[PDB]
Design a binder for this molecule. Sequence first.
Ligand SMILES: [Mg+2]
Ligand SMILES: [Mg+2]
Ligand SMILES: [Mg+2]
Ligand SMILES: [Mg+2]
Ligand SMILES: [Mg+2]
Ligand SMILES: [Mg+2]
Ligand SMILES: [Mg+2]
Ligand SMILES: [Mg+2]
Ligand SMILES: [Mg+2]
Ligand SMILES: [Mg+2]
Ligand SMILES: [Mg+2]
Ligand SMILES: [Mg+2]
Ligand SMILES: [Mg+2]
Ligand SMILES: [Mg+2]
Ligand SMILES: [Mg+2]
Ligand SMILES: [Mg+2]
Ligand SMILES: [Mg+2]
Ligand SMILES: [Mg+2]
Ligand SMILES: [Mg+2]
Ligand SMILES: [Mg+2]
Ligand SMILES: [Mg+2]
Ligand SMILES: [Mg+2]
Ligand SMILES: [Mg+2]
Ligand SMILES: [Mg+2]
Ligand SMILES: [Mg+2]
Ligand SMILES: [Mg+2]
Ligand SMILES: [Mg+2]
Ligand SMILES: [Mg+2]
Ligand SMILES: [Mg+2]
Ligand SMILES: [Mg+2]
Ligand SMILES: [Mg+2]
Ligand SMILES: [Mg+2]
Ligand SMILES: [Mg+2]
Ligand SMILES: [Mg+2]
Ligand SMILES: [Mg+2]
Ligand SMILES: [Mg+2]
Ligand SMILES: [Mg+2]
Ligand SMILES: [Mg+2]
Ligand SMILES: [Mg+2]
Ligand SMILES: [Mg+2]
Ligand SMILES: [Mg+2]
Ligand SMILES: [Mg+2]
Ligand SMILES: [Mg+2]
Ligand SMILES: [Mg+2]
Ligand SMILES: [Mg+2]
Ligand SMILES: [Mg+2]
Ligand SMILES: [Mg+2]
Ligand SMILES: [Mg+2]
Ligand SMILES: [Mg+2]
Ligand SMILES: [Mg+2]
Ligand SMILES: [Mg+2]
Ligand SMILES: [Mg+2]
Ligand SMILES: [Mg+2]
Ligand SMILES: [Mg+2]
Ligand SMILES: [Mg+2]
Ligand SMILES: [Mg+2]
Ligand SMILES: [Mg+2]
Ligand SMILES: [Mg+2]
Ligand SMILES: [Mg+2]
Ligand SMILES: [Mg+2]
Ligand SMILES: [Mg+2]
Ligand SMILES: [Mg+2]
Ligand SMILES: [Mg+2]
Lengths: 187, 105, 147
Amino acid sequence: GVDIRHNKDRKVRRKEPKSQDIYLRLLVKLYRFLARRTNSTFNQVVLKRLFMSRTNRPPLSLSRMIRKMKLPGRENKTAVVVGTITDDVRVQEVPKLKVCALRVTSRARSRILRAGGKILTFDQLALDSPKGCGTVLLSGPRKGREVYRHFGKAPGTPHSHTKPYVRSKGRKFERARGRRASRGYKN
Amino acid sequence: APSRNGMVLKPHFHKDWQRRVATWFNQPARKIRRRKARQAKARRIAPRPASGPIRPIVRCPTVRYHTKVRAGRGFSLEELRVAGIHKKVARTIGISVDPRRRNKS
Amino acid sequence: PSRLRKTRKLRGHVSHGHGRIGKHRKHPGGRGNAGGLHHHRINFDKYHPGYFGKVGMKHYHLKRNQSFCPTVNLDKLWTLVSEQTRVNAAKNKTGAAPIIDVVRSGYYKVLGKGKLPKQPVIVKAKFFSRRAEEKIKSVGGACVLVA
RNA sequence: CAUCUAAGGCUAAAUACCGGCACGAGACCGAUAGUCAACAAGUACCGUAAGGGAAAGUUGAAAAGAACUUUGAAGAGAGAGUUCAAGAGGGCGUGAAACCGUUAAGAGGUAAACGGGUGGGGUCCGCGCAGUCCGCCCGGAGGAUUCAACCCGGCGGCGGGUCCGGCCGUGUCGGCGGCCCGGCGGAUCUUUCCCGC
RNA sequence: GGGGACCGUCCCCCGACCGGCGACCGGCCGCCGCCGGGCGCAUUUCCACCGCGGCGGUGCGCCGCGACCGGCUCCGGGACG
RNA sequence: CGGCGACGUCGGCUACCCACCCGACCCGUCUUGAAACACGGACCAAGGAGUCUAACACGUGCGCGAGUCGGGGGCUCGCACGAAAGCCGCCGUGGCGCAAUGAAGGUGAAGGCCGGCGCGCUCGCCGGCCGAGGUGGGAUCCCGAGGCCUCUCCAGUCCGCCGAGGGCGCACCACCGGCCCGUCUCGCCCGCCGCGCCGGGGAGGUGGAGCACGAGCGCACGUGUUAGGACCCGAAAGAUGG
RNA sequence: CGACCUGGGUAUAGGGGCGAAAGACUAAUCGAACCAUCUAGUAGCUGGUUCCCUCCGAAGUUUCCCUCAGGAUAGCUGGC
RNA sequence: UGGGCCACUUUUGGUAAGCAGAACUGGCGCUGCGGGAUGAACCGAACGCCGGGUUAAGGCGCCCGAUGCCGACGCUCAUCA
RNA sequence: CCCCGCGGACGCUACGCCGCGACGAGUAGGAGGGCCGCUGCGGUGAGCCUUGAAGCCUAGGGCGCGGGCCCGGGUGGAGCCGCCGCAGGUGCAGAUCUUGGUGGUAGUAGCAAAUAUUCAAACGAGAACUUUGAAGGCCGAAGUGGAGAAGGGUUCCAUGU
RNA sequence: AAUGCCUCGUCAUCUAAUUAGUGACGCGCAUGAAGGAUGAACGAGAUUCCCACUGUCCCUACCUACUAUCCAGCGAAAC
RNA sequence: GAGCAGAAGGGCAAAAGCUCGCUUGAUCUUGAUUUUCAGUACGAAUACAGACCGUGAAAGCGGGGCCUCACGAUCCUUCU
RNA sequence: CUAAUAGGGAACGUGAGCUGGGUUUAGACCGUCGUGAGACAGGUUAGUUUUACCCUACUGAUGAUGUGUUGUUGCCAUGGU
Ligand SMILES: [Mg+2]
Ligand SMILES: [Mg+2]
Ligand SMILES: [Mg+2]
Ligand SMILES: [Mg+2]
Ligand SMILES: [Mg+2]
Ligand SMILES: [Mg+2]
Ligand SMILES: [Mg+2]
Ligand SMILES: [Mg+2]
Ligand SMILES: [Mg+2]
Ligand SMILES: [Mg+2]
Ligand SMILES: [Mg+2]
Ligand SMILES: [Mg+2]
Ligand SMILES: [Mg+2]
Ligand SMILES: [Mg+2]
Ligand SMILES: [Mg+2]
Ligand SMILES: [Mg+2]
Ligand SMILES: [Mg+2]
Ligand SMILES: [Mg+2]
Ligand SMILES: [Mg+2]
Ligand SMILES: [Mg+2]
Ligand SMILES: [Mg+2]
Ligand SMILES: [Mg+2]
Ligand SMILES: [Mg+2]
Ligand SMILES: [Mg+2]
Ligand SMILES: [Mg+2]
Ligand SMILES: [Mg+2]
Ligand SMILES: [Mg+2]
Ligand SMILES: [Mg+2]
Ligand SMILES: [Mg+2]
Ligand SMILES: [Mg+2]
Ligand SMILES: [Mg+2]
Ligand SMILES: [Mg+2]
Ligand SMILES: [Mg+2]
Ligand SMILES: [Mg+2]
Ligand SMILES: [Mg+2]
Ligand SMILES: [Mg+2]
Ligand SMILES: [Mg+2]
Ligand SMILES: [Mg+2]
Ligand SMILES: [Mg+2]
Ligand SMILES: [Mg+2]
Ligand SMILES: [Mg+2]
Ligand SMILES: [Mg+2]
Ligand SMILES: [Mg+2]
Ligand SMILES: [Mg+2]
Ligand SMILES: [Mg+2]
Ligand SMILES: [Mg+2]
Ligand SMILES: [Mg+2]
Ligand SMILES: [Mg+2]
Ligand SMILES: [Mg+2]
Ligand SMILES: [Mg+2]
Ligand SMILES: [Mg+2]
Ligand SMILES: [Mg+2]
Ligand SMILES: [Mg+2]
Ligand SMILES: [Mg+2]
Ligand SMILES: [Mg+2]
Ligand SMILES: [Mg+2]
Ligand SMILES: [Mg+2]
Ligand SMILES: [Mg+2]
Ligand SMILES: [Mg+2]
Ligand SMILES: [Mg+2]
Ligand SMILES: [Mg+2]
Ligand SMILES: [Mg+2]
Ligand SMILES: [Mg+2]
């Protein structure tokens, strides 16, 4: 006998996409070779994000992409996102961007191309930079989801600001006892 | 029994609902029957409009919809009076008339 | 598909995943939201604070159409008109400003979240907020009220 | 201020339909299932009564449903015959298990039965019983639309400044070319030529 | 309300320059290969047979034996400090 | 390298019977504890128990994406399939999302730097720019002195690798600021068709399921909880009419 | 020879009848008959809960509950 | 899951209990295997299917593997050892 | 500038293949895989089958850790299966489970309330039991007698089996 | 006392011997008056004693009928 | 070795005890924290901050009792 | 009376062995308690005691294995005493 524990032996992580999309599987084949046969850590990050689920690949708005590419020293670099590029209608001017994305919304694609920009798929990015040189690897807001408002400490505990699950919002729905000092307590 | 975080749910299934259940398997047949009746009616009124009488321009009541205009039940009697149409001749020539609607403006 | 479920994997296991000691009985704890103040009180207080009791004034015969007032922020104001309206006004030599009627687009109140591009615009609305009017006047525009 | 005009009356359509008449269909069930009822089933039968309520499908293509002989009082048999088949014989397609009879083999005083390990016997299996095969080379003796190289033709593969076209992507101009002699749109401007105040 | 102009996209064209002939195709060439027909008709090529032939691979119908090499292990001698 | 090989032997056996040695209490179940003198089980066959609907929650896959969704209706030879599929767009009505907060009346989410002025009075009139602030971490990316080569050198030609340091910093986390709504405390100004028991603004705390460049919608699948006969079987009872 | 035995006909019906009284009898049923339905009534209680291999792997403890054969809650578990 | 139970040690009530109640660690429950003849908990040791070697705890007259050592030194006679 | 040789194994269903190291108890419970199994639907196998389908039987040959599966022989006589998806009324040893069938018990308990039979003959394949005759008995007129009511409903009576 | 715990009360009587019976006493755990106390007849009511009678017993035996038993036929169930 | 209201324990001497004088911090408020704890509530408590006060010459001390106990949700009512 | 009239166990031995007096259902009476229904380790009276044919044990009764068959006469292991 050996004095060890086996409850953490199996590491839980995506070794492959759970998707059956054959186009995603083909460029997983491409970047699995690139990660293995180069020393670039960019390829390893891109490969592991290809495995990732959709909630782990949030969409990236045009405004956020423009803002991150406008930081100093990032000119003439390719913004790479493993996910969807989404139009933002809150921005009025689109600069010349070179972007590589898994998906681009029809209206975001039209805006980028009118600005004189360039859109690449991930196989075109592999040809353009096999080691991922001159790239800005971006991500959408991971915690920009409604589920994260309900996560955290329970709503009925002090100093917790987590949203409760209510069927309807109104003055009759979970606002009396435990919510104000006039009805029992507040915390 | 409640279990961890959840929503307080109140299903309305305490009242023997299974004895009054409306399935919709006759929905495609009802659409066919309505369509056939529409076609038969249009054939019956040969050159007359298939939809029916002409309806008036009507503004929707509340503050949610008063920016919207739809079709009303029938032309008011003041409208027919100044259009020179008898309120009994109007219905025979395909004009719908609503005698209980007034004109505020 | 019933072939993908635990019941196919629980064939041969006597308790069907519900235990030998506590078993699967009909309704231990009550039916529905039973005992939300007595023996499920901790759950109700922990996850649904405010559940019990009355708050506020009740109002008979609420008509939601009376309080219908959809709102649009300033950062989305220029999306209500075509892009051609915008670009023509920007390159316009004169001081002519386009009219955006948010009531036509389906909004009544103009709120002031975000910022406006620096070009004048005439905004027609039922209601404005204080900061929305302040920012519209900042870019050289005007606020005009409709009913 | 708004809105209607009660205490009289009629009225089609859109809507409903586990009873009825007549139909069509099904990712349904397949005789302990599906209706209780695939059949002389709300039958037989039970209860004073209200009421309760089954079981029960299948020979064969065709009855060709076993003439005739023989034993027995008969049931039942042995022969014979029909059939593709009665090792299909009127509750007869197939015909499992439990259980039983007989035959064969083995065994038997710690109830049987079981796990592991061998051994003995038995039934079968192995084209078992002189034990694979095939590549190159050497030698021997034989056969031959007879080999390399050349010529003619056919077809492919690869390459060619585009050799020549046909083109493809990106821009690039007169827009001659599309509101008549090309479309679709636009919350862009207008009769400052035209039909409604 | 019509008719216009303008803008944005488009769909065909009249032409040129730019990158390619590509995984959108043909013609010419050049190289290469295959096939068919001639010619080549024998120290070539191929076919089948024999040797209890050799060199390789695999494997012996069954039952067995030996040898050396290496890994692990339990022992035994002999000698030195 | 040896022996042996057809009507007797060769190999095989999971499988049939038998013998022997060692091991071996009868399963299911409740239970701290079952071989129990605890209960159910004579044997065999067939049947026999987590289902479907609705509603949530999270995860996962798919499409579109600040949107998304025609499910109700309608149009399409009315019909083998087809009760399907297709289409509508001035059918998107509507739902959910895109805004919160207050009991409500209601209100309702942009700052940063550089300048001249009243007094740069904790500050009001503007200008110019930019467009959600900053600190500490932060995958990745960028620069990079200095090294790594050839038969050798005085002297640069082209790019590949290692590389101390430095830089921009995704997502996310911690913290500090800022903005919106409620409510306090303090205080001084501004507006005018209504000069008001009118309207607006400031600073400092504090309450919110908020903002702070969206992430949702629809569909499918899984798991969990729930209402329904609700995994299956089971009361003593209660009620209505005979 | 009696407050006697007995046939048939009648009357009283279910929370009702009838009882020289035993909660007796009321069709083998009586401290509330029988029949059908509501009804698959409810059950924190008993019994059962159907294929294989691989991997991980407990709790009988805290707080609250007309709570003590049960739950919610934290803990311990697994999966992503 | 929210019935636990056992052992060393500490420990409360009880004359005591295979009693009732605590603390600590380990175990059984959920666990087979070697030993204690036998046995939920003790001692050793935890487990995929096997071959070889060596052990633990425990043993080595015979059952029953192993002292069939020319084992060492004493003590002990029991008519309930 | 390889060429007297014009030549040079396998591989890589990438959801594949290969290498190295450590590890392997398990109730309640969770998860994964299943080229495990049942039924039906959409595709597919130019699938199988009267020269023999399903089912069943089998001291037959095997494969797999296993769930199970393939093949030989026999019986049977008309339909069936593989693969990719889809969908379930989808897997049994238990429930004093439901229905059906069958054992041991076991040729056992038993065929014992009201005194009782015997001889001869006939018919008949067959006689303890039928019929006739002869005996011996019982009911003993409040009957084991002769008739009715209720109830039954053809049991009445002949003939035949 | 069918009502008394202490209790098998105490005294007398019945017997060889009596927690039994009867008579008596009575501060009676906790008797008592529409029910108390009597009293003939009656009783498949409860109790004690005596005569007679006997197999209840000492102490068992024998006999009769039907079974069981064995046979022919027939043939279950519980578990 | 007394007393400090009370049970017990702690604490306390120009104190926290006794006697006087003046008083109403036993008042109006927002948050944070501790205790039980699930890190929920109630109760109780601690440290602040903003008012308005008391007392003292002042430093300060005081938002009840020297500390550890002396108490109470939703709904409804009633008052401000 | 006697030698003595010792104490105990065997599911407080022994109910498909019996009996049913007692306790311990339903009827009823009295005393006490209780408003009452009713209660009383208080008294009293009346109150269904089911099944063996299975296995073993035991009691008896045939048999069985081995001496070739079969019979007569015998011995005593063992068990009881
Ligand atoms: Mg483990
Ligand atoms: Mg398990
Ligand atoms: Mg089972
Ligand atoms: Mg309570
Ligand atoms: Mg049926
Ligand atoms: Mg059948
Ligand atoms: Mg017969
Ligand atoms: Mg046949
Ligand atoms: Mg048959
Ligand atoms: Mg047989
Ligand atoms: Mg049990
Ligand atoms: Mg127990
Ligand atoms: Mg058991
Ligand atoms: Mg026992
Ligand atoms: Mg028992
Ligand atoms: Mg039980
Ligand atoms: Mg039993
Ligand atoms: Mg059974
Ligand atoms: Mg079955
Ligand atoms: Mg359609
Ligand atoms: Mg709308
Ligand atoms: Mg930062
Ligand atoms: Mg902050
Ligand atoms: Mg949940
Ligand atoms: Mg049920
Ligand atoms: Mg009730
Ligand atoms: Mg009574
Ligand atoms: Mg029921
Ligand atoms: Mg239990
Ligand atoms: Mg329990
Ligand atoms: Mg204990
Ligand atoms: Mg347990
Ligand atoms: Mg464990
Ligand atoms: Mg162990
Ligand atoms: Mg052992
Ligand atoms: Mg021992
Ligand atoms: Mg070993
Ligand atoms: Mg030993
Ligand atoms: Mg030995
Ligand atoms: Mg001694
Ligand atoms: Mg191990
Ligand atoms: Mg394991
Ligand atoms: Mg089923
Ligand atoms: Mg079964
Ligand atoms: Mg007999
Ligand atoms: Mg008899
Ligand atoms: Mg007589
Ligand atoms: Mg008579
Ligand atoms: Mg007769
Ligand atoms: Mg007495
Ligand atoms: Mg006596
Ligand atoms: Mg007396
Ligand atoms: Mg009186
Ligand atoms: Mg203060
Ligand atoms: Mg104090
Ligand atoms: Mg006894
Ligand atoms: Mg008895
Ligand atoms: Mg007995
Ligand atoms: Mg008695
Ligand atoms: Mg009694
Ligand atoms: Mg009284
Ligand atoms: Mg009696
Ligand atoms: Mg003797």
